[PDB]
Amino acid sequence: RCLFVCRHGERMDVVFGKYWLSQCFDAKGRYIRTNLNMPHSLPQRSGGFRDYEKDAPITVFGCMQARLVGEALLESNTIIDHVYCSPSLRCVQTAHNILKGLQQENHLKIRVEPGLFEWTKWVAGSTLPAWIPPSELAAANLSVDTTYRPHIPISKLVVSESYDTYISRSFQVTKEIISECKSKGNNILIVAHASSLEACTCQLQGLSPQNSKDFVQMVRKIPYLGFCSCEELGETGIWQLTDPPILPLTHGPTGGFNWRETLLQE
Template structure:
């Protein structure tokens, strides 16, 4: 009813000339409530990100340690010869030294990484971080160069929860390469240097066991028998996701042949020594298990190799059938 009255008042009389008609005199102003003048923000719909699916494919990444400061002026034991004071003799030497109870002489048998070795390991970690590979376990040889390689890779992966390293003496290099077992970093040394090591892990073999094997491990098949037991320990863990194994070239080859059921084996000590050319420093060999047949296959293109100038980290598995 009120609306009709307002409309009747708004109709101009017929006597008014339309040319001089002023609507403001006839139409009452519309009063807008004060509450309407406040801006109203429509809530945005919540963007729910789809959950990231964890990779369940079972893979083992065989990674050789980075470049080692064990040659010429890069040798750490040589750098300490001047009254046990660390001297920079090469720009490729490590910037940060490692504190160890056994002293600088231990570097002769257990050398650290060079700057190039650190950089190569970090590039491997970045390559692994680009994919959701669900890497959950890291195994390493007790050698300092392998532990530092593992530390650099883990640091570059930027995981929400940093992975702890499981030190396994069974992954140490062939004992025929040594005249004695090196003085590895002790548990106190590892803690003092800030290395994130899994102290709850019980290794399959101890350092004392290596000292016993030093006199009996004479042939390549003895090395492969030792590694075979380490492989069984690794496979006994989680059945999904990825495992990193950082070790030496002959040991990685032994793991590769054990998992892929290769029948050809190295025959001489020279065959083992030449494997440093088949598995370059910071090389990555990716083995993936088929969920149906449970066989392990080489996925060489999953992690890209590192190439610089005329050097590449591409793996070339040797063939001993001929």
């Protein structure tokens, strides 16, 4: 048995900055493509385009990262029997595109688990992002399981949550995920956040969590699609981090370029 945990792909809001909505949406709040790193379309959301502010999508290159990981899993014959993700759109889109690369997009149905959402301290304000429900995610051609009953529904998350609460629910939900997949296929994939890789696996392995200051510093090191593997040893039944079955993915930037501001014109 193996638990794979990885981070979502490149985020639109990180690339395109504080006012990224202005690069993606017109005066009427309709999506527009102003860069090749943006897709042809984005889902309509119940509260309009500003719902994207606390729940940004991945980029085209975010999609490509996800697909490269899926293809690498396929190429290594790493069979994924179940896939879960955080309700964050970026996590759902990442999971969908791993499935594409895996060529399992018509077989695997992604189980959206609010339990896997990151520490709610990272959310601005006193309300949660307006996550797109699984029924709408499926309507947007993301391979989500609309029949999945989450272990920690949105109703059970609080924005006030302590670090301890975040680690504890991550431990709790990870055990419930493993428990329900037992004897239903060896490999489980979680697609979530930078913080998830340690939060989902720390107490699973019997380890004590770090203090929150060291935790936050560490979490800043997890690249997009950062990928870890936590295996259950048959002999002892103990879970332990091990080398993933795929190579790491590393690439650099392609910076912003305005030809008028740079090339000689006079």
